[PDB]
Ligand binder design. Sequence first.
Ligand code: CL
Ligand code: CL
Ligand code: CL
Ligand code: MG
Ligand code: MG
Ligand code: MG
Ligand code: MG
Ligand code: MG
Ligand code: MG
Ligand code: MG
Ligand code: MG
Ligand code: MG
Ligand code: MG
Ligand code: MG
Ligand code: MG
Ligand code: NA
Ligand code: NA
Ligand code: NA
Ligand code: NA
Ligand code: NA
Ligand code: NA
Ligand code: NA
Ligand code: NA
Ligand code: NA
Ligand code: NA
Ligand code: NA
Ligand code: NA
Ligand code: NA
Ligand code: NA
Ligand code: NA
Ligand code: NA
Ligand code: NA
Ligand code: NA
Ligand code: SR
Ligand code: SR
Ligand code: SR
Ligand code: SR
Ligand code: SR
Ligand code: SR
Ligand code: SR
Ligand code: SR
Ligand code: SR
Ligand code: SR
Ligand code: SR
Ligand code: SR
Ligand code: SR
Ligand code: SR
Ligand code: SR
Ligand code: SR
Lengths: 115, 119, 246, 145
Amino acid sequence: SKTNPRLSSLIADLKSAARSSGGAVWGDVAERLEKPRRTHAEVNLGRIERYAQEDETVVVPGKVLGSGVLQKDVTVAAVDFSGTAETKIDQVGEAVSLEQAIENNPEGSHVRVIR
Amino acid sequence: SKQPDKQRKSQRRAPLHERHKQVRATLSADLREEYGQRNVRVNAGDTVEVLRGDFAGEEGEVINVDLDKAVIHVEDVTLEKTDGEEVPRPLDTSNVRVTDLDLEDEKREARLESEDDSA
Amino acid sequence: MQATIYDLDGNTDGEVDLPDVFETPVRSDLIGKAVRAAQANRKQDYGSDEYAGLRTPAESFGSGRGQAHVPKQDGRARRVPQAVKGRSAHPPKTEKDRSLDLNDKERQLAVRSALAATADADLVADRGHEFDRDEVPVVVSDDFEDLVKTQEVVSLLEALDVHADIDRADETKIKAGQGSARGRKYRRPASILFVTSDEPSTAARNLAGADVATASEVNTEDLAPGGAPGRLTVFTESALAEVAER
Amino acid sequence: TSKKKRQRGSRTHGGGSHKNRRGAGHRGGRGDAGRDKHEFHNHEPLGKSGFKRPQKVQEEAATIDVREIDENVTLLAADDVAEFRVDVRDVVEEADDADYVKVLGAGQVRHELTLIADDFSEGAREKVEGAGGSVELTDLGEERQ
RNA sequence: UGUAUGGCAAGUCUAACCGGAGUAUCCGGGGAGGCACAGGGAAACCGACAUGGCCGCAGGGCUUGCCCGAGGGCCGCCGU
RNA sequence: UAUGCCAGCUGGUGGAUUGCUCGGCUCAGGCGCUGAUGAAGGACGUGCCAAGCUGCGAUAAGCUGUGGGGAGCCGCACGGAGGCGAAGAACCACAGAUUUCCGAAUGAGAAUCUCUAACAAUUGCUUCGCGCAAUGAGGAACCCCGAGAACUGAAACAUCUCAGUAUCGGGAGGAACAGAAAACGCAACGUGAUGUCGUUAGUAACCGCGAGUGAACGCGAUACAGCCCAAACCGAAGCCCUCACGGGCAAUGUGGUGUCAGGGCUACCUCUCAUCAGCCGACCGUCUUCACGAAGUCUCUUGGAAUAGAGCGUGAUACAGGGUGACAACCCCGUACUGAAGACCAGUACGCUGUGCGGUAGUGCCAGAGUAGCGGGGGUUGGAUAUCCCUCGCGAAUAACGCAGGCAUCGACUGCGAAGGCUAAACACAACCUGAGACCGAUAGUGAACAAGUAGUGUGAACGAACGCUGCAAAGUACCCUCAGAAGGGAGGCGAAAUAGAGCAUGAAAUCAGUUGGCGAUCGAGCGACAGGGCAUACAAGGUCCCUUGACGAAUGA
Ligand SMILES: [Cl-]
Ligand SMILES: [Cl-]
Ligand SMILES: [Cl-]
Ligand SMILES: [Mg+2]
Ligand SMILES: [Mg+2]
Ligand SMILES: [Mg+2]
Ligand SMILES: [Mg+2]
Ligand SMILES: [Mg+2]
Ligand SMILES: [Mg+2]
Ligand SMILES: [Mg+2]
Ligand SMILES: [Mg+2]
Ligand SMILES: [Mg+2]
Ligand SMILES: [Mg+2]
Ligand SMILES: [Mg+2]
Ligand SMILES: [Mg+2]
Ligand code: NA
Ligand code: NA
Ligand code: NA
Ligand code: NA
Ligand code: NA
Ligand code: NA
Ligand code: NA
Ligand code: NA
Ligand code: NA
Ligand code: NA
Ligand code: NA
Ligand code: NA
Ligand code: NA
Ligand code: NA
Ligand code: NA
Ligand code: NA
Ligand code: NA
Ligand code: NA
Ligand SMILES: [Sr+2]
Ligand SMILES: [Sr+2]
Ligand SMILES: [Sr+2]
Ligand SMILES: [Sr+2]
Ligand SMILES: [Sr+2]
Ligand SMILES: [Sr+2]
Ligand SMILES: [Sr+2]
Ligand SMILES: [Sr+2]
Ligand SMILES: [Sr+2]
Ligand SMILES: [Sr+2]
Ligand SMILES: [Sr+2]
Ligand SMILES: [Sr+2]
Ligand SMILES: [Sr+2]
Ligand SMILES: [Sr+2]
Ligand SMILES: [Sr+2]
Ligand SMILES: [Sr+2]
């Protein structure tokens, strides 16, 4: 039972997007967020640098932390970002909120899920 | 203390000299203007007007002032016993108003007029 | 954003930028947590006497007389929980920790969210406060801290169409239950919170339901009494600015 | 509603037979009783193993992997920018209560660093030098011999 | 020792205690110290994969079976 | 239909329930010793009438003074009689008077009395005389020094554990104890009296190496404070009693010096603001108590009563709490603000008086013995070879010496001088004062809201209850009838209410009397569930139900 009101909203919006528009990842991300927090993603930068690729939005079904280096000019979208994480990402690319992602890309196209 | 039990306790157990404040009644308009007080310890000489009981509206002379029970006897404010006798109906001074004072005591008159103290 | 400053007559007197903290997203769950903690933290330890019901050499006769093996003293049962005048089995205990911990960050985040809830007119009205106004919180010139008469603060709140909240709070409820016997007979709505900088408003403090506070220490409770976000507040210009770095 | 809250009316509160939840018998003894008889299962075996040296004769090195230093070169602008030069003793946290600072060689080194520490691993040297770097042993660190 | 929820995150939390104050609440300070950030070995002592290969779920892509495939799975390789 | 069954009704019985809280329980702050000048405790007295409680002590619910207070009063406890108070009583604060007997109990003896001047007993001083003094006993626990179990855990049990716990003996204080290194040993170019708090750490260490037991250094804090002798060198330069005279002590050493920044002595430099002794002596703060202290008791309706509803008005540096015939900022006490006193902080801080800090050179002058240390036997500890202590035995050096740094010996190194002494503050408890509460609310909470350690039980040690509520006001029921009648009853009176009439708010169940409905002296027993009939039913809070016929019409189906 998610107690955070905003996490609750995000999930309702992720769903609406997966249902209304063509998005099939949003509903997928929604399902992971509905699961226990321990199962949520805690991803460091070193892992985005290794697997992400330019012009393909990185979707993290959890939170991004600041360990390691990120050189790629990628748009990372996560539920939340650590202070250092967001600062490091914006230096080379762009850290975006999952709620922004949904508004801009409701069809959830050209997106790589990372955990 | 803010605790009800202690409050009621200090009132029901106050020593004689402290019980005077339990027999205080509000002064009339003129009396409030004249002595610069809102109330005063009702004396057995004072005249008073009942403002609350079944005797509300009545005027009378204070006949007795019991400190032990913190209650007073006013002239004509009575009850008829079964044998026909007429006995006083004790009144709480907070349900009464002083309309006239007994200033035969130089000490009370002095206290009433002084700005530093109050009677 | 911007906040219209008002002089002691209720007329506009310029305006300042409403600090960023008031943009902080409302987090009623975190707020309620901070409120729950602060309320628990002032609760006093209690518990029955360690030895109540144990002060007796009562013994059980055992089998033989057609009676249950219950400890008795002078033909009267004692000690055991099922016995009248017996010890309480699992009573309130003094040793118990009745305090709740809270991470400073988590609590500081709640203060900010509570602060922010103040800036939302719909929330404030939802919380229950009665007022006729669009902007909120109510910003006033620092010359408010110099007022003395309570009545003077009244005329000002009437000039701001915000006094109705005090008429909401001008009613004491005589509670149900025995708290009455413990000195908690009455209670009343929580109305306006006045936040200043140097010292709490001695002039406003006695207003029905009003709570006064200073910007350096205004907590989650006065900001969101009972854990409910959005209290109708009035900040003094300097306070408004000082509250920014909380 | 919790589990505890639902126990009223259950009589046994989940303990099975009312003959179960009595004294320590239901536990096979108090504490670790029977750790080598009826309850030997999942218990480190009985016995003594090894020895301990006196604590004041024990040294405690403060270690750090090159990966850590290297990933934070640009961030550590507060430290020498030679033809990058870094005195590890200034990087490692808790480097005073430690007997010395040793650099371990885990990870990569995408830069040319000049490291100063009391000790380095064979892999720490290889990696730093192999990236056009040099390794400097501190005066204290001059114990290797 | 689990779990659910919440904060922060290569970090995290302060303890005693200090200041303030609306004075047991509360605001500020306090990182001593704990746990995590490397392991192996009785000890001396030594000290590791910011990814090299193959499968492949979800998801994405395409010209609609073919690509990319985090997690996961099987190996390599590394420290002792 | 009798005996009777079930449910209800009126009235009891009972005292649950609801509401109420003069009592508890717990937390916090403050404060904190008493006694031979006879305590604490107990006994017996003491009132106009007085049994209990409280007070007091033959001056007996009190006497005196000063201040406060004030028109009343004569305790709990509302009677009767009577008295006291403006000669300022009551009442409160401070100080004083009195203060029986037993009691450490002290002239001697004794179940609270008695017999014929008494510090009994033990001590110090001493005019050697009880002449001057001390001790004794108490206190809620806290504190210090001694003696020291077992149940229990180990699933038995011996070591171990419970535990240095329970309990016992001795003793101090308002706090105790500890304390200015023969320390530490993050081994250092480092720390620097002692407690305590956090941590170090369930780490090191112990252990049928089982179960279990369990530190320290350091660190962060709190509070901070450092000194005095013995001896060397001086050698009566001294101390105590007394108003003085005079006496006592003291060469077996009073007194000066001095105390590891070693000191003494000799020779110089310089100087003291250290120390030690002593005078003065708080601010602030905290706890408690007290003075002062704003604004409605206006209209209408209801009511027995307005603090209620409706209307109108006010204060607020005061909307904490209590009282008052129902819900009160504005009726009364209080509350905010300001101010005053006492106590604690504290004979402290500061200030002051006096004294003299310190340095060089020389000098083997001085520096604590059954000690340091070793062995035998025990206890204790985490202390392991390496804790601490007891007991028996043995037993050293002299600063050019000695001890410590977790096995011994020797060398090096670093640290530090034992076998003499004192020492503020920060910490423990809760008797006592005050405050507080998501604690209990009369079978609860204390055993104890009440006569509570009461009644009562036991030879004794010891054990030990239960009992709270009339009403706004006693208006607590006059008169009359009846009766053996201050009984009870009837009638009557009071009050909103007597089914509020005295263990008197409310008044449940079990259960009782009378009574209503259903059943009932030919009939069978888990007392009922579900169906369907009889009989029974004021309103309200449920409004449906029956029959012809017609419509629809699952499985089934003439
Ligand atoms: Cl990661
Ligand atoms: Cl070891
Ligand atoms: Cl040290
Ligand atoms: Mg006057
Ligand atoms: Mg009990
Ligand atoms: Mg209730
Ligand atoms: Mg005698
Ligand atoms: Mg056993
Ligand atoms: Mg065994
Ligand atoms: Mg032990
Ligand atoms: Mg040590
Ligand atoms: Mg001397
Ligand atoms: Mg032992
Ligand atoms: Mg009781
Ligand atoms: Mg009754
Ligand atoms: Na008892
Ligand atoms: Na506690
Ligand atoms: Na059981
Ligand atoms: Na730290
Ligand atoms: Na019969
Ligand atoms: Na005291
Ligand atoms: Na004596
Ligand atoms: Na009597
Ligand atoms: Na006396
Ligand atoms: Na003598
Ligand atoms: Na056993
Ligand atoms: Na046995
Ligand atoms: Na053992
Ligand atoms: Na250190
Ligand atoms: Na009144
Ligand atoms: Na020995
Ligand atoms: Na040492
Ligand atoms: Na009772
Ligand atoms: Sr009285
Ligand atoms: Sr009385
Ligand atoms: Sr038997
Ligand atoms: Sr179970
Ligand atoms: Sr048992
Ligand atoms: Sr075995
Ligand atoms: Sr540290
Ligand atoms: Sr923190
Ligand atoms: Sr993999
Ligand atoms: Sr010190
Ligand atoms: Sr010595
Ligand atoms: Sr009872
Ligand atoms: Sr007997
Ligand atoms: Sr009658
Ligand atoms: Sr049969
Ligand atoms: Sr058909």
